[PDB]
Design an enzyme around this catalytic site. Sequence first.
Site, PDB file in Angstrom:
ATOM      1  CB  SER A  96       3.386  -8.056   6.904  1.00 19.55           C
ATOM      2  OG  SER A  96       4.338  -7.414   7.468  1.00 19.55           O
TER       3      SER A  96
ATOM      4  CE1 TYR B 196       1.578  -2.940   4.664  1.00 18.12           C
ATOM      5  CE2 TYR B 196       2.617  -3.474   6.876  1.00 18.12           C
ATOM      6  CZ  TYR B 196       2.371  -3.788   5.349  1.00 18.12           C
ATOM      7  OH  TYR B 196       3.369  -4.510   4.744  1.00 18.12           O
TER       8      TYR B 196
HETATM    9  N1  LIG Z   1       9.722  -4.498   4.003  1.00 23.56           N
HETATM   10  C1  LIG Z   1       8.732  -4.821   2.784  1.00 23.56           C
HETATM   11  O1  LIG Z   1       9.049  -4.398   1.415  1.00 23.56           O
HETATM   12  C2  LIG Z   1       7.207  -5.488   3.267  1.00 23.56           C
HETATM   13  C3  LIG Z   1       7.271  -6.203   4.458  1.00 23.56           C
HETATM   14  C4  LIG Z   1       6.356  -7.114   4.812  1.00 23.56           C
HETATM   15  C5  LIG Z   1       5.352  -7.298   3.954  1.00 23.56           C
HETATM   16  N2  LIG Z   1       5.380  -6.639   2.624  1.00 23.56           N
HETATM   17  C6  LIG Z   1       4.276  -6.834   1.513  1.00 23.56           C
HETATM   18  O2  LIG Z   1       5.008  -7.195   0.296  1.00 23.56           O
HETATM   19  C7  LIG Z   1       3.840  -6.955  -0.611  1.00 23.56           C
HETATM   20  C8  LIG Z   1       4.450  -6.291  -1.911  1.00 23.56           C
HETATM   21  O3  LIG Z   1       4.941  -5.102  -1.618  1.00 23.56           O
HETATM   22  P1  LIG Z   1       6.497  -4.673  -1.876  1.00 23.56           P
HETATM   23  O4  LIG Z   1       7.193  -4.451  -0.574  1.00 23.56           O
HETATM   24  O5  LIG Z   1       6.991  -5.753  -2.960  1.00 23.56           O
HETATM   25  O6  LIG Z   1       6.242  -3.205  -2.499  1.00 23.56           O
HETATM   26  P2  LIG Z   1       5.719  -2.801  -4.168  1.00 23.56           P
HETATM   27  O7  LIG Z   1       5.371  -1.062  -4.028  1.00 23.56           O
HETATM   28  O8  LIG Z   1       6.988  -2.960  -4.877  1.00 23.56           O
HETATM   29  O9  LIG Z   1       4.638  -3.717  -4.464  1.00 23.56           O
HETATM   30  C9  LIG Z   1       3.478  -3.242  -3.931  1.00 23.56           C
HETATM   31  C10 LIG Z   1       2.449  -2.947  -5.177  1.00 23.56           C
HETATM   32  O10 LIG Z   1       1.042  -2.730  -4.869  1.00 23.56           O
HETATM   33  C11 LIG Z   1       0.480  -2.103  -5.927  1.00 23.56           C
HETATM   34  N3  LIG Z   1      -0.688  -1.211  -5.420  1.00 23.56           N
HETATM   35  C12 LIG Z   1      -0.617  -0.094  -4.287  1.00 23.56           C
HETATM   36  N4  LIG Z   1      -1.756   0.448  -4.579  1.00 23.56           N
HETATM   37  C13 LIG Z   1      -2.540  -0.013  -5.657  1.00 23.56           C
HETATM   38  C14 LIG Z   1      -3.942   0.254  -5.962  1.00 23.56           C
HETATM   39  N5  LIG Z   1      -4.506   1.065  -5.603  1.00 23.56           N
HETATM   40  N6  LIG Z   1      -4.364  -0.429  -7.048  1.00 23.56           N
HETATM   41  C15 LIG Z   1      -3.579  -1.593  -7.785  1.00 23.56           C
HETATM   42  N7  LIG Z   1      -2.235  -1.952  -7.045  1.00 23.56           N
HETATM   43  C16 LIG Z   1      -1.958  -1.000  -6.354  1.00 23.56           C
HETATM   44  C17 LIG Z   1       1.407  -1.076  -6.686  1.00 23.56           C
HETATM   45  O11 LIG Z   1       1.345  -1.476  -8.000  1.00 23.56           O
HETATM   46  C18 LIG Z   1       2.922  -1.744  -6.358  1.00 23.56           C
HETATM   47  O12 LIG Z   1       3.751  -2.328  -6.893  1.00 23.56           O
HETATM   48  C19 LIG Z   1       2.823  -6.233   0.104  1.00 23.56           C
HETATM   49  O13 LIG Z   1       1.580  -6.559   0.370  1.00 23.56           O
HETATM   50  C20 LIG Z   1       3.543  -5.690   1.361  1.00 23.56           C
HETATM   51  O14 LIG Z   1       2.350  -5.246   2.610  1.00 23.56           O
HETATM   52  C21 LIG Z   1       6.460  -5.787   2.450  1.00 23.56           C
END
Ligand SMILES: NC(=O)c1ccc[n+]([C@@H]2O[C@H](COP(=O)([O-])OP(=O)(O)OC[C@H]3O[C@@H](n4cnc5c(N)ncnc54)[C@H](O)[C@@H]3O)[C@@H](O)[C@H]2O)c1
Lengths: 281, 281, 283, 281
Positions: free
Chosen positions: D173, D186
Amino acid sequence: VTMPAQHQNKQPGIESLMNPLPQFEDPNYKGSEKLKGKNVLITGGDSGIGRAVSIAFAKEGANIAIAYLDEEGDANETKQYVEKEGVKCVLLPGDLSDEQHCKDIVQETVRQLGSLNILVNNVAQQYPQQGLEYITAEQLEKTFRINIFSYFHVTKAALSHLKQGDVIINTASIVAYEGNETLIDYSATKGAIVAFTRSLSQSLVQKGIRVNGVAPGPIWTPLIPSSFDEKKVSQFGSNVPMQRPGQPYELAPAYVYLASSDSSYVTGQMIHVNGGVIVNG
Amino acid sequence: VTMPAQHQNKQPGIESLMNPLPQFEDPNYKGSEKLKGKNVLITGGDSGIGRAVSIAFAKEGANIAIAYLDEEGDANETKQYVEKEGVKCVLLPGDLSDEQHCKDIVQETVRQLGSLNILVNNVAQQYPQQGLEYITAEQLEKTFRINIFSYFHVTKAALSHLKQGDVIINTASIVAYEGNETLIDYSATKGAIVAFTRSLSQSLVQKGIRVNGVAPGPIWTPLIPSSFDEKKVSQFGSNVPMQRPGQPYELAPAYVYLASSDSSYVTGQMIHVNGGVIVNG
Amino acid sequence: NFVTMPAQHQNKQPGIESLMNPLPQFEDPNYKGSEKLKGKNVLITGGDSGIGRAVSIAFAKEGANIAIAYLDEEGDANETKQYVEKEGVKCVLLPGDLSDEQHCKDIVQETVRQLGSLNILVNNVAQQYPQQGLEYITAEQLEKTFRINIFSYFHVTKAALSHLKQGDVIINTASIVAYEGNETLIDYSATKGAIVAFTRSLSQSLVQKGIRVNGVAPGPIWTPLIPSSFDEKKVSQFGSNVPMQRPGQPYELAPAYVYLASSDSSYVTGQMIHVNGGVIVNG
Amino acid sequence: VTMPAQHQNKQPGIESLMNPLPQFEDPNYKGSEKLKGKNVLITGGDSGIGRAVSIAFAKEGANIAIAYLDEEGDANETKQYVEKEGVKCVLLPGDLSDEQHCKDIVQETVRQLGSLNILVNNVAQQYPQQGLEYITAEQLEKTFRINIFSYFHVTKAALSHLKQGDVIINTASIVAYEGNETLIDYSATKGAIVAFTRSLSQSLVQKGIRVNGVAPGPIWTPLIPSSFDEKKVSQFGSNVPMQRPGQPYELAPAYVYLASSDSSYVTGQMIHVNGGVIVNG
Ligand SMILES: NC(=O)c1ccc[n+]([C@@H]2O[C@H](COP(=O)([O-])OP(=O)(O)OC[C@H]3O[C@@H](n4cnc5c(N)ncnc54)[C@H](O)[C@@H]3O)[C@@H](O)[C@H]2O)c1
Ligand SMILES: NC(=O)c1ccc[n+]([C@@H]2O[C@H](COP(=O)([O-])OP(=O)(O)OC[C@H]3O[C@@H](n4cnc5c(N)ncnc54)[C@H](O)[C@@H]3O)[C@@H](O)[C@H]2O)c1
Ligand SMILES: NC(=O)c1ccc[n+]([C@@H]2O[C@H](COP(=O)([O-])OP(=O)(O)OC[C@H]3O[C@@H](n4cnc5c(N)ncnc54)[C@H](O)[C@@H]3O)[C@@H](O)[C@H]2O)c1
Ligand SMILES: NC(=O)c1ccc[n+]([C@@H]2O[C@H](COP(=O)([O-])OP(=O)(O)OC[C@H]3O[C@@H](n4cnc5c(N)ncnc54)[C@H](O)[C@@H]3O)[C@@H](O)[C@H]2O)c1
Ligand SMILES: [Mg+2]
Ligand SMILES: [Mg+2]
Ligand SMILES: [Mg+2]
Ligand SMILES: [Mg+2]
């Protein structure tokens, strides 16, 4: 001894004299219209990384204007590979260390291709020296004039032809990040390119023009045997974690990514393609 | 609003005409002989950050040679503060965009002080423009000739005088790391300084000469009202997390740290003194 | 690589400085204090040896009272205490396991009780367990490494907050490995990357409260963590890889902490000082 | 204001409940067999970025095993898009905060697909708090167990099955580079991921396994309305230079680049897809 000891007396180097010949194409690479109908100006697109980028872009459906100093044989060969893909290719020889010519290659690209969508600033010269005391004012200025001033002048001229959705890619280098003790002036030009990329990205973001860079590590191109001596040429690329120099075809996809809508949410960044050297990226 | 609206018509700026006067000295700063007997050359030491560095270095027992363009009033004042600490001070006016003058200030420093131990490259000019299309070749080349070529020429001349235990510090800028849309040429020169610093540290490490840099953020100095409009000046420094510009005295202890044996295990690095802007440092 | 030190190993971590050959140098004989931290009250975790000992002594030379938290090296903590008190300042010893949350709270309360207040917090404790690859890192080792290397920084700093005010400071020890990576210390490097991001984020969190947060990223420093974690072969060549072709001594790190702890760095927050023998980290 | 004010009382968030629905697919995206026949395990591939990555990888000919917590509706929907491309899709629900489950998803992927070629560690949870004092040990440990410990355990178990030519991609991130005042824990997990990526790349390079990362900026996914309050959600993405949050589909091509032979000379790196935020990359 990764490569055979060899050296060319004049720079810019000639690709046709190298053994082995750099691999500029991945036979398995499949284009998918990522740049269909786009008009590109690539400085230094006749050989090395530029050649591989020109050909990959053509495969993606782009028309390519190739600027180079005087490597007519290399440029023609590149043009053959480009046109093999069914797109338009224009050759623009000339010295980009002259501001006026920097303007002319841009005017000429727009007259022959009709417009300009993607500018790839990629020319460079490098003169290794054992220390700062061996860098003359003449070499310092020459190195900056082609390595960074040309990027300013060509990009400046291209701005009146760019509009929302257009793109600029600058070729920098790992040395901007890690330094190089025997290429102090060259490295400074590459650091200049990195800050140029960052600042210009912020300047053009509201105009919808993205600006990014590619920072290669040691890639087998005519720049190598025409700048380094034989001993060093023979050990080229042996320093990086993958223990080999890269081949130009390994750089093209980075440029395709940055040049197409695949990177629509990306600006001001650098793609490091360097064989595993960690640069706190 | 952070400062009173003001603008100086010519650059380099004059410190005595500023309101409020930059604070170039920390009243509670106590010297402790960190640089006792050391001979220092600082380019741009007459005012702003260089002035604060000159004075702190003097409080630490170093003799100071100060190069600057033509600000005699500012230089003179800086000289009085330095001499109050009972050390030697030498004023070296002249245009450092000229290679021979770069060599002459080094020779003159050695003549007057006896030797050279610490070189601080710190001169700069900046010419804000609304976009790349407004940067003439003349401005581009002028900006590079003073901001980076002088660092190359002065340092090169200094090399024959530096030995094990000696030190080079280069003033870069936060703009090399973050970019600045209105200072594209200037930011490019600062990126060149960063790479220069990194490459030179590796070149000289086995010679026992350390090379590092300082990247300031917005600091209240004559560079500001002599480059930016009165509106920009009035809000200067409100953008950083500490919500104020830095004062020149706040930069000096970073130079002291880098100049002295306190940083004996540090080379190739950058100290970010910028009011809390995160730069992946 | 080449031999830089005598081959040696301590089959017990945290290491004991008195057993090392040569003894690390934690004091620069020529260093002159100048009251940069006069009357300040400091809490330093892992301040009993190596870098921490060097920092404690330098801070004492600058007029600071030092509360030193450590695990169980009473011999080292006491010897450090002797050096601190020789500078004419106060010193409090706080032994115990910082992998436990409550103890992290307790050492803060104790410091405030004995010194009277807290101005500067140096989070510096760490354990490292080299392994030839990820497949040799157990869940046990993973959690243990994180619990001491980064959870303790959260808990101690968290407890310190109700005592810190405008003008106070936090310094975190990170490592070059957060920037360069280290193939034989994958979990350790991950905790050091966590510290870098914690430093950046916390600095923004506390800037309007006038509390600065910065870090120091050491390279290879000759300290008890080295012979107690690496095998003899590795110890013998320690520091040979960096441009200066030698390991750093602990005294060579202390001035960076002094810089960050004092008003000398009043316009600095969120940053890292890299003290590593010349390794370029795009800093 | 960039999005409609909304908020979900439980995390992980559910994608079908969002307004507008995130765009996980580029209608004009054209696959070109970049990952034909490759077997991929993606953790968190059920929604958000992971959903866009699964679908783009399917279009490039890869077989996809998707791990997630319990968002069955979202996972099923993703499965339909993947299978529409004629490739195999495997769903693997369960709590990856448990070490054994992390091992089991790997064993299961290999059983269902035959082998493992590409691992994308992408799972995360985030719990904003106004300050450090508001982060309980429970939240801290929970955040680390899923965000970084799972990356260790899943990757560790994958190593038995990875060989020369295989690849690991970790989702980090921008917060690891820039910091985040309300996401201190986080952000620390994401900084751990960056260091993990760098160290593991060096550990695995001679085995011919590449390890890189993607650092997204503000992307419109279920993570956002499920962690941030309605006010914050409504202004999400307005802080970056492109003045909008990104859509999941804008992230997919970076993963495709890192997963395929297109990045054969790339390891230890991070691709910043963040709307123009400069991070000294
Ligand atoms: N603005 C943003 O969306 C943002 C910014 C920077 C980084 N990210 C990163 O993107 C990645 C994907 O997240 P996203 O934004 O696509 O949200 P998302 O919620 O769609 O994806 C995250 C997934 O993690 C899984 N998860 C959470 N806890 C779990 C557990 N205990 N066991 C198994 N699975 C679990 C869930 O199934 C969830 O779908 C993450 O690593 C997040 O930190 C997101
Ligand atoms: N190991 C490497 O090859 C390496 C490493 C890092 C970065 N780079 C960068 O790669 C880029 C492309 O170089 P390359 O390695 O492909 O070698 P190359 O020789 O094939 O390409 C450089 C081109 O620059 C052009 N050029 C040189 N001087 C010119 C002038 N005066 N006027 C107009 N054109 C001129 C030449 O036409 C030449 O073909 C350069 O910017 C270089 O700095 C290369
Ligand atoms: N906001 C800031 O003030 C800020 C931010 C980042 C970096 N910097 C850097 O700080 C350094 C010092 O500048 P400052 O802000 O203290 O302003 P300053 O004007 O006080 O110092 C700059 C000096 O450069 C000298 N100089 C300019 N042109 C010269 C020439 N042609 N020949 C010889 N000397 C010449 C002048 O004598 C002048 O005093 C510069 O390198 C600048 O880029 C400043
Ligand atoms: N080469 C190096 O020495 C090196 C390189 C980079 C970073 N560092 C960092 O320097 C810092 C200090 O380490 P050092 O090298 O001075 O070695 P050190 O062993 O002398 O100091 C570390 C201290 O941590 C303390 N500690 C360990 N486990 C503890 C626990 N469970 N509870 C309470 N205290 C505990 C010990 O008391 C020990 O004295 C660490 O954060 C380390 O990661 C060291
Ligand atoms: Mg050529
Ligand atoms: Mg002046
Ligand atoms: Mg100890
Ligand atoms: Mg989900």
